[PDB]
Each structure stands twice: as C-alpha cells, then as structure tokens.
Design a protein around this ligand. Structure first.
Ligand SMILES: [Mg+2]
Ligand SMILES: [Mg+2]
Length: 158
C-alpha cells in the first residue's frame, strides 16, 4: 500500500540517507522534516531555539510533520520527533513507522559524543520502539537496509 513511511531514530542512525534510498527504490517522494524546516523558514534549529526555545522548535516540528505527511512519500524525521506523544500517534495513524536502530557506540562513531548518544538512547530508545511498527539494524549499508525493509514490510519496488 502507499501510506507514508516515517523513518525514526537518533542522530547518526542514517535516517536521511536510508529514507532517500528507500524512497528511490519504491518510487516515492522523499522529505526530511528538519531540512524542510530549514528551507521553508530560513532558520536553523539553533535560530529557532534562540528565539522561541525548545518548546517553539517542537511546535514547528509537529507542524512540519503534519504539513509533509502524504501518501507515496518517505518522511525522515529528526531525532526528537518521537518526544511528543501527538507526534507518535500521528505517525502510526497516518502511515507506517520504521526505527533505524544502532547502539550508542555506533551512533557516536558515525561522524560525517559516545556518552551523549548513550544518554539520548536512555531518554528515547523506548520511544523509538513504542512508535515503530518495524525495527531494522541501522549499521548495515543503506542499500542492505532498503532491501531488508522492502522484504519485511512487503513493499514492491517501483
Ligand atoms: Mg498507520
Ligand atoms: Mg514498536
């Protein structure tokens, strides 16, 4: 089916890259909520936070989620998208959610911090699992994740 596919996970799990390659494989559109915010508002997350705080950024992020969710589209989401319950509900309702899981060690390794990702996971691991319909090993190359997702999720290639 063509419900929107939400990619969730912590910074460093490869969301944008896997999202983009999955979208290409399925013939879907691709949008990253963080990138959408930047290029529609002109403001970075630091700008938004400096002007309106973390609460203001989280509201914008919720709004972005709602604005870009549509069928036949893969949506890569920022690390903190899973913090608000309404965001978690929105994603499981509107579509199907995939958590790109990696231990903190590997998240920290990816740097195109080890203990800061450990702490991110203590706060958010359970939230990623709560919202995810499907959990995949994000330490594989993107192409291998793409392949595994199409099989597990029973999605045809474009
Ligand atoms: Mg759904
Ligand atoms: Mg789950």
């Amino acid at each position: 089916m063509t419900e929107p596919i939400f990619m969730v996970g912590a910074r460093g799990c490869g969301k944008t890259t896997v999202g983009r390659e999955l979208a290409r494989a399925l013939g879907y559109e691709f949008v990253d909520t963080d990138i959408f915010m930047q290029h529609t508002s002109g403001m970075t997350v630091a700008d938004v936070v400096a002007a309106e705080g973390w609460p203001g950024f989280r509201r914008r992020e919720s709004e972005a989620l709602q604005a870009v969710a549509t069928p036949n589209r893969v949506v890569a989401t920022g690390g903190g998208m899973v913090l608000l319950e309404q965001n978690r509900q929105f994603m499981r309702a509107h579509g199907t959610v995939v958590y790109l899981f990696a231990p903190a060690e590997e998240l920290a390794l990816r740097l195109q911090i080890a203990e800061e990702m450990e702490a991110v996971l203590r706060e958010r691991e359970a939230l990623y699992q709560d919202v995810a319909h499907y959990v995949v090993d994000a330490t594989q190359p993107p192409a291998a994740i793409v392949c595994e997702l199409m099989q597990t999720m029973r999605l045809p290639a474009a």
